[PDB]
Amino acid sequence: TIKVFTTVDNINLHTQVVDMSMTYGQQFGPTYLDGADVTKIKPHNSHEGKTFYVLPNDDTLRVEAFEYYHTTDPSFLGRYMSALNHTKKWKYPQVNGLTSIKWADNNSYLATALLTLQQIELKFNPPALQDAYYRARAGEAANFCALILAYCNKTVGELGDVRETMSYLFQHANLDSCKRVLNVVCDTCGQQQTTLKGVEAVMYMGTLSYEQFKKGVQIPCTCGRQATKYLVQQESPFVMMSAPPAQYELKHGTFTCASEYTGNYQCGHYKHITSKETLYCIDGALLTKSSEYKGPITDVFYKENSYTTTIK
């Protein structure tokens, strides 16, 4: 027999003594060592003193998992470890000053998400994400990518959606101060104001142009007639403007970054465009520079702080 440590966060360690003739599963249940599933593996002499991840099956581990990951779903740790086995094998090159991801397992949506996070002001709340994102920016993004997949209930290889992924991440971020007030003008119903906070204050679906959002966009009223919705006030470090993919021109110096999607829900591919001294198309490990850019844009990010309209 040998002494090991079990954990859910690699910080709070629990001592265990295991029988070398039984599998780690019969004793601990699902068990992982350095991201490898050892549930059906019998203890080995070379395992002594090492640290093993396990599913939170007692209340002490559940609280530790909740404190570290900010979720109560007990299967989260297993989803995280399963994804991590693959993401450790991905490559995370520095492209145009940012940590990207070499293409693998249909991971283009994760790369453009990661590239985007490095260009907007966003702080994560869960300790696990705080630690994984700091390492991700340093070029070791395996844990961060595996966490994203676990939080989004996606498995490695699944085609992903950036806007939906950013939505999950934003929920685990500090957007407390963010505020948005909108006005819908229906010349039959009048003016109807709304106020949004948190993630609803930074995400909008329907138009890519922040400026058109301020001038006014045509959207059906609650009565069904065509009305006009325009931005009254915004208080945020950034705004995410999304719309179904359609040909769209990205003007240099008028946005921060954007996501391009080519394909459909069974097969497609994301590319990332960022406005630096010139437009740069970051395509995983590939990089292309252009004076102008046009393509099927689906998300556009803009920097903000405080905006108040002038419309009466």
- Residues forming the site for Cl ion (CB under 5 A): 135, 140, 255-256, 302-303
The Cα 273–Cα 286 span in angstroms is: 12
| Residue 194 is a binding residue for its own copies (CB under 8 A) | no
| Residue 305 is a binding residue for its own copies (CB under 8 A) | no
* Sole residue written with tokens 């046009």: 294
| Residue 94 is a binding residue for its own copies (CB under 8 A) | no
From candidates 177, 194, 278, 288, binder to its own copies by CB under 8 A: 177
| Residue 11 is a binding residue for its own copies (CB under 8 A) | yes
Q: DSSP letters of 243-301?
A: EEEEEEEE-TTS-SEEEEEEE-SSSEEEEEEEESSSEEEEETTEEEEES-EEEEEEEEE
Task: Look at phi and psi of residue 261 and say left if phi exceeds 0, alpha if psi is from -120 to 50, else beta.
Answer: beta
Nearer to its own copies by C-beta: 8 or 55? 8
| Residue 59 is a binding residue for its own copies (CB under 8 A) | no
**Contact of residue 302 among Cl ion, its own copies, Zn ion, none (CB under 5-8 Å per partner type):** Cl ion
Nearer to Zn ion by C-beta: 178 or 184? 184
Contact yes or no for 42/61 (Cβ under 8 A): no
| Residue 184 is a binding residue for Zn ion (CB under 5 A) | no
CA-closest candidate to residue 275, choices 289, 295, 285: 289
Task: Point out which span in 93-101, 110-118, 185-193, 197-205 binds Zn ion (CB under 5 A).
Answer: 185-193
The Cα 312–Cα 109 span in angstroms is: 41
Task: Write out the binding residues for Zn ion, residues 219-258 only, by CB under 5 A.
Answer: 221, 223, 225
Handedness of CA 243, 132, 71, 84 (dihedral sign): positive
From candidates 131, 161, 260, 299, binder to its own copies by CB under 8 A: 131
| Residue 216 is a binding residue for its own copies (CB under 8 A) | no
Q: Which residues contact 304 (CB under 8 A, 6 or more apart)?
A: 234, 236, 237, 238, 239
CA-closest candidate to residue 200, choices 228, 179, 230, 222: 179
| Residue 57 is a binding residue for its own copies (CB under 8 A) | no
Contacts with its own copies, residue ranges (CB under 8 A): 11-12, 68, 123, 125, 127, 130-131, 134-135, 138, 140, 174, 176-177
Contacts with Zn ion, residue ranges (CB under 5 A): 186, 188-189, 221, 223, 225
